[PDB]
């Protein structure tokens, strides 16, 4: 079945052949008829010329195994039966695996069968036993040179920003969310699983009107702080931020709430507060990617772990699903598909809780 899939997919793409042949040689195929086709498939590629139904039915005919397979009927069957050739490789791996299994069994059985006929050897028997068994786009970020490498943030991409505890990963995501809301005209959705909804607000009220040593927390302010919050409150008042602090929520619910907001008001970003804290993670990563693709919106998942790739990898997939993986240290964009990979350096105030340009 897997075998038919490979062959069938070649008659389809037929740039399917390239990876099929990287993975399989004819002998990996259990059925001979398939062995004969895949070989002929390759024998044609070795010109030439290219590889399609006609040209292969021709080669088979020319080395006279055309009717020794199916006819063209079975070749058409393969072709007409397979829907998609974005697998193949595959498919390829499946057949390759089962080939290996046959080869194990063969060389293993050959050892037992050989166990009675020598005896005699023991040492040749045991040595030739190891010997045998060993074979800008986008959505602007706010931050000038982050924009350049990325060009956004763009729609259908999952962006995972990871950093060790208290490096500023939340404070960084918040500032993105905030810039997007106050400066563009595009609703952002924030899920703040850890910190409460209103403890989040001050952290981006502070980030604005450049407020706080005085401090909002410790009660009373100066006539400079007051006359400041008012504008900060005012400017953040008209922003398009939606916050959900629901303790710890399953993916299907992030997806449900985001889906409803898209049709009613707009949406441009999903900024989920930390992944490791949503409710294995590989199944979640997959689902966040799909969420981004469905809603044509960049999803910013924050994550907890120097840094470098294997720091998060060892805890749930992510690597192959996220199409852009940022690290806070210096913002290290260690993986992205848009293009470039390298370090963009930001300044960080603290008192105001802002990440600023340089």
């Amino acid at each position: 079945e897997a075998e038919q899939a490979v062959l069938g997919a070649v008659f389809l793409d037929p740039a399917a052949l390239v990876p099929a042949s990287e993975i399989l040689i004819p002998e990996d195929f259990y059925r001979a008829a398939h062995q004969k086709i895949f070989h002929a498939m390759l024998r044609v590629a070795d010109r030439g010329e290219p590889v399609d139904l006609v040209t292969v039915t021709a080669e088979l005919a020319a080395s006279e195994q055309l009717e020794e397979i199916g006819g063209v009927s079975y070749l058409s069957e393969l072709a007409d039966a397979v829907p998609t050739a974005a697998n193949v490789e595959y498919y390829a791996r499946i057949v390759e695996e089962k080939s290996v299994l046959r080869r194990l069994i063969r060389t293993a059985t050959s050892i037992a069968q050989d166990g009675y006929t020598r005896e005699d050897e023991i040492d040749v028997l045991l040595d030739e036993a190891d010997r045998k068994i060993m074979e800008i786009t986008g959505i602007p970020t706010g931050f000038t040179e982050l924009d350049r490498m990325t060009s956004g943030f763009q729609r259908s991409d999952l962006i995972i920003v990871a950093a060790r505890p208290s490096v500023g990963k939340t404070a960084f995501a918040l500032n993105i969310a905030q810039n997007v809301a106050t400066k563009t005209n595009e609703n952002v959705a924030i899920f703040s699983l850890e910190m409460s909804a209103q403890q989040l607000v001050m952290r981006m009220l502070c980030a604005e009107g450049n407020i706080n040593a005085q401090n909002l927390r410790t009660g009373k302010l100066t006539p400079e702080d007051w006359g400041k919050l008012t504008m900060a409150m005012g400017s953040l008042s008209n922003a398009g931020i939606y916050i959900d602090d629901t303790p710890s929520i399953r993916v299907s619910d992030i997806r449900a709430k985001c889906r409803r907001l898209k049709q009613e008001s707009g949406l441009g970003m999903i900024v989920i507060d930390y992944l490791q804290l949503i409710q294995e993670v590989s199944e979640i990563s997959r689902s966040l990617k799909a969420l981004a693709r469905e809603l044509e919106v960049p999803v910013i998942a924050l994550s907890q772990l120097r840094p470098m790739m294997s720091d998060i990898r060892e805890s749930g997939s992510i690597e192959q699903d996220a199409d852009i993986v940022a690290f806070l240290y210096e913002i290290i964009i260690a993986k992205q598909r848009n293009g470039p990979v390298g370090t963009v350096q930001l300044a960080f105030i603290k008192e105001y809780n802002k990440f600023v340009n340089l």
Binding site: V54, T57, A58, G71, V72, S73, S76
Partner: protein
Amino acid sequence: LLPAFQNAERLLLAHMMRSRDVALVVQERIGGRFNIEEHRALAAYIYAFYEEGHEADPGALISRIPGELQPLASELSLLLIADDVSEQELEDYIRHVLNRPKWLMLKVKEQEKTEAERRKDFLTAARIAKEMIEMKKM
């Protein structure tokens, strides 16, 4: 278990029989044009119905409806549906019905592939087959 297009034909009736707002959209897009005789005659009966300015409900339809259509038109009004057909649902169903004559087609050239094969004209049968892959891609 029943092939796709047929279920689409089925479900479309279930909907238009239940909501005459859908039936109006189905009329401009599909004749029918429906692929099965029973489904055609019903479609006719459904379409007319409301063109009699008629309110809308199966209790009215299943009572119409020669009597040889009734054991079928009854068991469609009971099928299983959310009332509300998604924007794409409709486009997916309709696509199935509308491009059915096209599948029923390539089995004509299918009988020409196998006939060419029998007279040993191998390379012509290959071409027909490579053509079928194309129509099948649609």
